[PDB]
Design a binder for this molecule. Structure first.
Ligand SMILES: O=P(O)(O)OC[C@H]1O[C@@H](OP(=O)(O)O)[C@H](O)[C@@H](O)[C@@H]1O
Ligand SMILES: [Mg+2]
Length: 218
């Protein structure tokens, strides 16, 4: 039996991707950079604040001091955080609270494995903090998804190996990170976007405890 689930935040528990996109878009327009469209923002998900900024600058080969790097990242995040102020336990995706409840009551460890440092804040606002045995700190990892570092760190934060764990994700990068940690990915979305070599569910209401047990088994 699997001993842990490792949850991505955005696109599994809820999704604030629209707000990250709007804030990043707004910042690029302010610094004169074209190309931050929705297509580009697909490669920004699963990706850290620092690495998302760098991808944006790289669009125009734009060079900045480390100080003006910090201020630009701070500008974007203040904007983003202003846009997620009304997030509540209404925003939690279908089946996720029940699954968290069923995982807890069966002694299955629950870890967050998000690239966002606003993760703690959102789980608080959604009243989900209590269910989480650990929240992997994206400040402390060496690389963004698809690197496996975040899911490895998450698994370790609940004293289990990734091989004892299930990873839940909406993104290609996230799924690839799960694969390379040694955890079992179960995706949510379309198999045209994520693949046909893994189990995909069409929405998060399909993420039930009995279904996870079935998949684990094969
Ligand atoms: O899918 P998840 O890993 O949960 O979220 C990924 C998001 O993390 C955010 O970090 P932040 O909140 O600015 O520190 C990034 O700025 C954003 O570009 C990215 O889409
Ligand atoms: Mg995600």
């Amino acid at each position: 039996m699997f001993k842990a689930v490792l949850f991505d935040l955005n696109g599994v528990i809820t999704d604030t991707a629209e707000y990250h996109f709007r804030a990043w878009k707004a910042l690029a327009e302010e610094i004169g950079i074209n190309g931050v469209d929705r297509q580009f923002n697909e490669q920004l998900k699963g990706v850290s604040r620092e690495d998302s900024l760098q991808k944006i600058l790289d669009l125009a080969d734009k060079k900045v001091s480390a100080e003006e790097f910090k201020e630009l990242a701070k500008r974007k995040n203040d904007n983003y955080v202003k846009m997620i102020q009304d997030v509540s336990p209404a925003d939690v995706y279908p089946g996720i609270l029940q699954l968290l409840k069923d995982l807890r009551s069966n002694k299955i460890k629950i870890a967050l494995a998000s690239a966002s440092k606003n993760g703690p804040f959102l789980l608080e606002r959604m009243n989900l903090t209590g269910y989480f045995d650990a929240i992997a700190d994206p400040a402390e990892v060496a690389a963004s998804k698809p690197a496996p570092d975040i899911f490895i760190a998450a698994a370790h934060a609940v004293g289990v190996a990734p091989s004892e764990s299930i990873g839940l994700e909406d993104s290609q990068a996230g799924i690839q990170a799960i694969k390379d940690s040694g955890a079992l990915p179960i995706g949510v979305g379309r198999p045209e976007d994520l693949g046909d070599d893994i189990v995909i569910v069409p929405d998060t209401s399909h993420y039930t405890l009995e279904f996870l047990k079935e998949v684990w088994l094969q």
